[PDB]
Amino acid sequence: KTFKQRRSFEQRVEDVRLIREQHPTKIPVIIERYKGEKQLPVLDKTKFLVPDHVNMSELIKIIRRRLQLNANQAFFLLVNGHSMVSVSTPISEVYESERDEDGFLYMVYASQE
């Protein structure tokens, strides 16, 4: 099951609230692999606390590194269900406009965009 099916809306709002109290400077992010994905591996965890000062470009590099990919492997990251308009935008700005109602910022990745 996906993160949203795993935890109730109430539980998600609560997780976000706790992250605000304990990690004020981090953006609560949910990163999941596309269900049809075959090449790309699954991450070790689902929710991440990303320093609010990094832009999407750096986050992509971070994710690629956590996945231990090589320069030849394709990587595409969807935010709030759609592709990113700008990769130079600070995640703090991205959060304010693409955040889910429960408070988390959802991302999905796959080999083909």
Side-chain angles (χ1 to χ4, degrees):
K1 301 182 181 186
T2 196
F3 185 74
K4 285 193 172 184
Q5 301 171 310
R6 220 139 71 222
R7 314 219 69 204
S8 65
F9 177 82
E10 173 174 51
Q11 280 169 162
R12 287 181 261 120
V13 169
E14 211 42 57
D15 301 332
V16 172
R17 300 265 190 60
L18 180 66
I19 297 177
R20 283 195 184 115
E21 288 285 347
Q22 297 178 174
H23 304 281
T25 66
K26 307 300 174 56
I27 298 304
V29 181
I30 295 301
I31 309 175
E32 302 174 283
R33 181 184 66 170
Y34 168 60
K35 287 308 191 65
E37 184 60 31
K38 60 176 272 187
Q39 315 298 344
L40 265 35
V42 174
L43 288 168
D44 61 78
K45 65 180 181 176
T46 304
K47 81 170 180 184
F48 299 72
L49 280 53
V50 184
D52 86 332
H53 73 274
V54 308
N55 55 41
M56 297 312 291
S57 179
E58 176 54 21
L59 182 50
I60 289 170
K61 287 179 178 61
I62 292 174
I63 302 308
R64 286 182 63 84
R65 282 201 288 273
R66 207 190 177 83
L67 288 174
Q68 295 161 54
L69 309 178
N70 59 257
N72 304 344
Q73 305 185 66
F75 186 77
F76 303 97
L77 187 68
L78 297 182
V79 174
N80 185 37
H82 57 278
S83 65
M84 303 177 263
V85 173
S86 51
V87 157
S88 68
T89 313
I91 196 171
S92 61
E93 297 190 9
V94 177
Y95 181 72
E96 289 223 317
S97 65
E98 302 306 321
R99 67 169 184 281
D100 191 274
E101 259 181 273
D102 66 8
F104 280 106
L105 180 60
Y106 294 78
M107 301 189 179
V108 177
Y109 67 84
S111 297
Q112 317 170 171
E113 59 170 311

